């Protein structure tokens, strides 16, 4: 009995995709509904769309764009072709919206059903799908991210806390640099970190949910995971007590570091994935590490929440599509019996 269930859902090569095209620069998974691969045959570019409900029937079509990201739910796709961005309805075969930027967009992502986040060299913008609005600048980038490869952009549930992540390879290390912006205080904070996520968490006795910020880093102090409340507790709330635990990197994982995080709000657990393909499971309330193992021989370069199970799904460099979820019937028993932590297990039970 293990606290989690692992599973290979797909091998992309068996869906007809060339290994050259299975990578961060050409393959996106903005939700667990779709995977999008930008392929190039001769001098014709194509997008292959894989509906995760009907994997065996790919929508492979010729297109002129350097970058493609599927809406989290709708059959709507955004395409970047130079400095020109377009939002396209696939089933209507029609253009909804277009915009031409001044600066190149080096990174972009859907943060909701309606909004595309646009990252330039200098700034972050949010572009609304509905209406006529042009991209709106939210904040200017901080010097500490200059020259970084941008790997992620995250928001809390209310869109009041915004987080940009960049990394940089140096001789003896990968530097992690984050910028956390408060939409209400109108101020940013530079932070050293490699992977992060927000979560809603209900403390017992409180009037409202707390908004939590969780981030992992492999820095000067070794592997660390921090869980802190962001913002002012509402009337009726006590504050969440800051946690600070370890991320263990074995000796044989010398160059390893964190790359992805998703958080289960059904179970209040943190899923953490590293560059080498290890997963770690932590309790959100206490910061206790429940579990750790190696799930992939190759880098998992993109993840999303597995929404039906409150788990994590990802894609690796070999084209394996993998997921990890909580085993709902075994996690309490495993904490009680294998971990020998009846206090944590009661607390999880009790909070259920």
């Amino acid at each position: 009995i293990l606290p989690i269930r692992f599973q290979e859902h797909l091998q992309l090569q068996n869906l007809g995709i060339n290994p050259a095209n299975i990578g961060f620069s050409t393959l996106t998974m903005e939700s667990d509904k779709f995977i999008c691969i930008r392929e190039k045959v001769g001098e014709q570019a194509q997008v292959v769309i894989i509906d995760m409900n009907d994997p065996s029937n790919p929508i492979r079509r010729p297109i002129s764009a350097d970058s493609a990201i599927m809406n989290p739910a709708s059959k709507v796709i955004a395409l970047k072709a130079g400095k020109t961005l377009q939002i396209f309805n696939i089933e209507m075969k029609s253009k909804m919206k277009a915009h031409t930027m001044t600066d190149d967009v080096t990174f972009w992502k859907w943060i909701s059903l309606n909004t595309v986040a646009l990252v330039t060299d200098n700034a972050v913008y949010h572009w609304s799908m509905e209406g006529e609005s042009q991209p709106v600048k939210m904040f200017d980038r901080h010097s500490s991210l200059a020259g970084c490869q941008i790997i992620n952009y995250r928001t809390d549930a209310k869109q009041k806390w915004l987080l940009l992540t960049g990394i940089s390879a140096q001789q003896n290390r990968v530097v992690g640099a984050m910028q956390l912006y408060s939409v209400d205080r109108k101020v940013s904070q530079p932070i050293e970190g490699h992977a992060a996520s927000f979560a809603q968490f209900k403390m017992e006795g409180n009037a409202e949910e707390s908004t939590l910020f969780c981030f992992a880093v492999r820095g000067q102090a070794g592997g660390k995971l921090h869980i802190i409340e962001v913002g002012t507790p509402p009337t009726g709330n006590q504050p969440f007590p800051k946690k600070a635990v370890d991320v263990f990197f074995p000796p044989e994982a010398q160059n390893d570091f964190p790359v992805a995080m998703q958080i289960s709000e059904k179970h209040d657990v943190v899923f953490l994935i590293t560059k080498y393909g290890y997963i770690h499971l932590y309790d959100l309330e206490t910061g206790t590490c429940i579990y750790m193992n190696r799930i992939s021989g190759e880098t998992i370069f993109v993840t999303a929440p597995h929404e039906a199970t409150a788990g994590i799904i990802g894609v690796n460099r070999k084209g394996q599509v993998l997921s990890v979820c909580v085993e709902e019937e075994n996690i309490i028993p495993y904490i009680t019996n294998v971990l020998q932590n009846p206090d944590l297990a009661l607390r999880m039970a009790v909070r259920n």
Binding site: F24, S25, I167, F301, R317
Partner: peptide, 7 residues
């Protein structure tokens, strides 16, 4: 130049 997933 080298994308991060290949580091």
């Amino acid at each position: 130049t080298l994308p991060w997933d290949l580091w």
